[PDB]
């Protein structure tokens, strides 16, 4: 996709992540953990269901039309009836082909996008306390126990708490 996160600098997805589309995987002194991120997951799901709803109902409520099957050829009038219908079918098939290609292109960019927005959000929370390792991971330059990790995940992490420790670990 356009942002180069999914199938990009994030090498692969996590089969273990079963209660969300996006999430956090960490390692600290006391262990490891994987948790879903609700906000980014919901943002992607909302946009895709939005597409589904606009799609799964326009309306084509048709009754009396024209004859479309013929036993024997009749000439001029039958040629036109056949040609009208054949023309209609090709145009609608074309619409259907293009719609799905456009929708799918966009859906892939949307989800790549939401992955990148989450990465950028966490990046901004961390400020000067962490460095991008290049694969969707931050190296955190201070001790960060399970409550610290959770504070990052729920958006209450306060970088000023750890900044002196982090700066000292980064640059010396």
């Amino acid at each position: 996709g356009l942002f180069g996160a999914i199938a990009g600098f994030i090498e692969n997805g996590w089969q273990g992540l079963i209660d969300g589309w996006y999430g956090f995987r960490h390692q600290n002194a006391e262990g490891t953990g994987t948790a879903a991120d609700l906000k980014s997951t919901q943002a992607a799901i909302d946009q895709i269901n939005g597409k589904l709803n606009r799609l799964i109902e326009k309306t084509n409520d048709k009754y009396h039309q024209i004859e479309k099957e013929f036993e024997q050829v009749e000439g001029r009038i039958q040629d036109l009836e056949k040609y009208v219908e054949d023309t209609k079918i090709d145009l609608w098939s074309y619409n259907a082909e293009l719609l799905v290609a456009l929708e799918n292109q966009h859906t892939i960019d949307v989800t790549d996008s939401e992955m990148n927005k989450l990465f950028e959000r966490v990046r901004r929370q961390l400020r000067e306390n962490a460095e991008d390792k290049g694969n969707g991971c931050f190296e955190i330059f201070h001790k960060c126990d399970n409550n610290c990790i959770e504070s990052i995940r729920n958006g209450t992490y306060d970088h000023d708490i750890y900044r002196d420790e982090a700066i000292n670990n980064r640059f010396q």
């Binding site: 999914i6 199938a7 994030i10 090498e11 692969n12 997805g13 996590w14 089969q15 992540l17 079963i18 969300g20 589309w21 996006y22 999430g23 956090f24 995987r25 390692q27 600290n28 002194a29 992607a44 895709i48 597409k51 589904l52 799609l55 799964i56 109902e57 326009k58 084509n60 048709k62 009754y63 009396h64 039309q65 004859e67 479309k68 099957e69 219908e85 079918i89 090709d90 609608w92 098939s93 259907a96 082909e97 799905v100 290609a101 929708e103 799918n104 292109q105 859906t107 892939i108 992955m115 966490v122 390792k133 969707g136 931050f138 190296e139 955190i140 201070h142 960060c144 990790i149 670990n169």
Partner: protein, 319 residues
């Protein structure tokens, strides 16, 4: 400085392939088929009013052929016309056949209104051994075979019906074609015959045509059926010097005609669906269908493709 936090996304073991503008096989975590390619093996009698012609096609139902009695009074959204319907009456044709069939189908009902036509001296209710109704010689119960008087007299017919109602009327009449000059005279005496039906704004003149024709259920003769529409304020004149298959009355026409006809052998079942194809009803929320261009009701749009998958998830990159 050494703890690590990684941001990522889900994956599954095996996803679904979809198309984009650039790639025709991209694997995504979930996808949704947009082309309905399965139909029910029956037609749903609900929510649309379906009327089964059974052994009668809609033209024979309008004419009142034997066995077509169940169609009297019948009202429909969609008339289901069976491919194995069969003529059970006097061999006929309609010169503008599809146009009459279209009008009947679209009108959506068989509401017949009886009128008495005071035919001077000619005999009425002429019947035929080709139109048996329980072995009794009979005829189209919406038509009246007029022949000679027994005193060998078929004089000029001249009766008018005025439409002063609040609905347009459909009159279906016919012209009989004998196979030799003899029959012409043993039926209508005069030779040639002829019928001329007119309105204030229209008119139609028919010459009967006499000659050898193939045998259709034991006969060489034919009837040619015609129709006239009489608006409110208009009226209709029947003139005959022979060969008129006169009408018994007129069909009621709805001002707004919203119905149609579906020709298929598919049985009528118990399901609920507002979309019917000649292959059966569709029960679906998909926007497209590849089952048949012949489709009636509230339907997905017909397309050529057998499958079109919409991505409903991100790219699938497992491990």
């Amino acid at each position: 400085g050494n703890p690590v936090i990684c941001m990522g996304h889900h994956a599954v073991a095996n996803g679904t392939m979809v198309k984009t503008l650039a790639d025709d096989q991209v694997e995504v975590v979930t996808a949704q088929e947009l082309v309905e390619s399965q139909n029910l093996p029956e037609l749903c009698p609900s929510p649309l009013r379906l009327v089964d012609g059974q052994t009668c096609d809609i033209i024979n139902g309008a004419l009142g052929s034997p066995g077509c009695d169940h169609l009297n009074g019948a009202e429909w959204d969609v008339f289901i016309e069976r491919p194995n319907a069969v003529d059970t009456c006097y061999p006929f044709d309609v010169p503008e056949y599809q146009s009459l069939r279209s009008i009947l189908a679209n009108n959506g009902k068989f509401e017949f209104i009886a009128e008495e036509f005071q035919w001077n001296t000619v005999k009425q209710n002429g019947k035929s051994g080709a139109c048996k109704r329980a072995n009794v010689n009979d005829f189209f119960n919406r038509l009246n075979w007029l022949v000679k008087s027994d005193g060998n007299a078929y004089p000029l017919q001249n009766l008018t019906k005025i439409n002063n109602g609040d609905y347009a009327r459909l009159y279906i009449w016919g012209v009989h074609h004998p196979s030799t000059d003899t029959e012409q005279t043993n039926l209508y005496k005069n030779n040639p015959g002829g019928v001329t039906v007119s309105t204030k704004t229209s008119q139609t003149s028919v010459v009967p045509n006499i000659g050898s024709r193939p045998l259709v259920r034991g006969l060489s003769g034919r009837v040619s059926f015609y129709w006239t529409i009489v608006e409110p304020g208009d009226l209709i004149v029947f003139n005959t010097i022979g060969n008129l298959i006169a009408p018994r009355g007129h069909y009621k026409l709805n001002n707004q005609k919203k119905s149609t006809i579906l020709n298929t052998a598919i049985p009528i079942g118990s399901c609920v669906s507002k979309c019917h194809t000649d292959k059966g009803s569709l029960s679906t929320t998909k926007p497209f269908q590849n089952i048949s261009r012949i489709a009636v009701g509230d339907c997905p749009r017909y397309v050529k493709q057998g499958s079109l998958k919409l991505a409903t998830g991100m790219r699938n990159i497992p491990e």
